[PDB]
Amino acid sequence: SISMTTKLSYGFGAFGKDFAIGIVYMYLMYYYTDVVGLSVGLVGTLFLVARIWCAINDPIMGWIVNATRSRWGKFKPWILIGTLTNSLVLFLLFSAHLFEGTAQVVFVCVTYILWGMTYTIMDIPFWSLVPTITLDKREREQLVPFPRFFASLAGFVTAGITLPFVSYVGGADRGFGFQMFTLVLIAFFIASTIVTLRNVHEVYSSDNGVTAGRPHLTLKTIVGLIYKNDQLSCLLGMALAYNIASNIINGFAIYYFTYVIGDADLFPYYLSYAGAANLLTLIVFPRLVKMLSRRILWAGASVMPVLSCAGLFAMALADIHNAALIVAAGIFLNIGTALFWVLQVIMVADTVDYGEFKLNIRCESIAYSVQTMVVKGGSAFAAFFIALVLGLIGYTPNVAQSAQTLQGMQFIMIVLPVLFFMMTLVLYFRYYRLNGDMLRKIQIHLLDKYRKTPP
């Protein structure tokens, strides 16, 4: 029933959506420090505060999107505004190398936080289009792999050709090449936004006379829809734990690839094989959901990175530091993250549907606001837990540290993501219920309701 054109246009939309932020996530540290000359402490504090601010802003953006009424619906206008304003703020962000002194710092602080906010404006409604397109289990399963694959491909093409571009254009003057590549990103992002706005046509969307929308809602009642929707709360917990675990693992990988190994011959192969695994598991997700249960795929999504953690734990117990083990851990982690993200989008859709069922309110913006809130709070809480463990083990900041202290810090860093994954799976298998006959019950209920309600 889903137009192949719709799948591919939403995929290109996701490509442009993530191709504009991968550069930030991946090289804003290197820009701010190696090009602009700012203290690592300042940059880290800014990143933490901004992630907290975005997490708090997310539900406000959900309230805004839900209470919106326009010609193109309640999502497309905010999608366009977000893309445009975020492109502007991105270019301004990577133009920080011009100023100096307090003028620079202030600039850097404004742009960055604005960027965050702006992207939030763009992010929530985009994904909220998913539950308004299908409403069916298999259709969602074979829909969301397109955008997830395209997001991952954007991230990996960034990691691949973002530095060669900055080097070719400008040369020496790294800020200039950065802003030129930024313009490239702006072009792709706006093209993708136009594509998704024209082609993606929301079907079962709030705004429709039959879809049980309640636009005039308070912030109190809307944020209460999160707690009242017990399944959306389960999703909140699951995704928060999974994001904390994956952020801790990614920070460990960054630390051991940037500072420790020093063998620059490895990271290319690690990235290549990780991207291969991720894109392959995304391509083959429509298959294997029928071959293997939805629950089974969630379990595997969290278990594969647990295998990666165990492998690198064995690696740390010795000092072999085998590159084969590194690439295997990366492959497993990437398979897990792909499965997780696909199932997570499908589950946000399922949860907005279950909210319309249990309650009588349809609200996609809030569920995907929860998604983005959790995406940001994951990094926030991972940093919090790492600082907690450091203070507990007595990690003086960048001063001489015992050998066993460092090895134990590494071991506990390996361990606690396993705890978070066990938490995700406990919560899933004990409280989640949207994978079987329940899903079809919700579907038939909503479809019959729409059929009976006067349009």
Residue numbers in the entry: 2 to 456
Authors' text:
The melibiose permease of Salmonella enterica serovar Typhimurium (MelBSt), a member of MFS transporters, catalyzes the symport of a galactopyranoside with either of H+, Li+, or Na+, which makes MelB as a unique system for studying cation-coupled transport mechanisms. The Na+ binding involves two negatively charged residues, Asp55 and Asp59 (helix II), and two polar residues, Asn58 (helix II) and Thr121 (helix IV). In this study, we solved two x-ray crystal structures of MelBSt, the cation-binding site mutants D59C at an unliganded apo-state and D55C at a ligand-bound state, and both structures display the outward-facing conformations virtually identical as published.
D55C MelBSt also loses the binding affinity with Na+ or Li+ and is unable to mediate Na+- or Li+-coupled melibiose active transport. Different from the D59C mutant, the D55C mutant retains the H+-coupled melibiose active transport activity, which excludes the role of Asp55 in the H+ binding. The D55C mutation selectively eliminates the Na+ and Li+ binding and converts MelBSt to a solely H+-coupled symporter. Here we report the structures of apo D59C and DDMB-bound D55C MelBSt mutants, which were determined by molecular replacement, modeled from positions 2 to 454 or 2 to 256 without a gap, refined to a resolution of 3.0 Å and 3.18 Å, respectively. In the D55C structure, the galactosyl moiety of bound DDMB exhibits a similar pose to that in the D59C bound with either DDMB or α-NPG. The densities of the 11-carbon tail were disordered and only 2 carbons were modeled. The glucosyl moiety pose is different from that in the D59C structure. The Na+-binding pocket in both crystal structures is nearly identical to the previously published D59C structures, with a Cys present at positions of either Asp55 or Asp59, respectively. In comparison with the Na+-bound WT MelBSt cryoEM structure, both the DDMB-bound D55C and apo D59C MelBSt mutants exhibited loosely packed side chains in this cation-binding pocket due to the absence of Na+ (the D55C structure was removed for clarity). The data support that the D55C mutant retains the H+-coupled symport activity mediated by the protonation and deprotonation of the Asp59 residue.
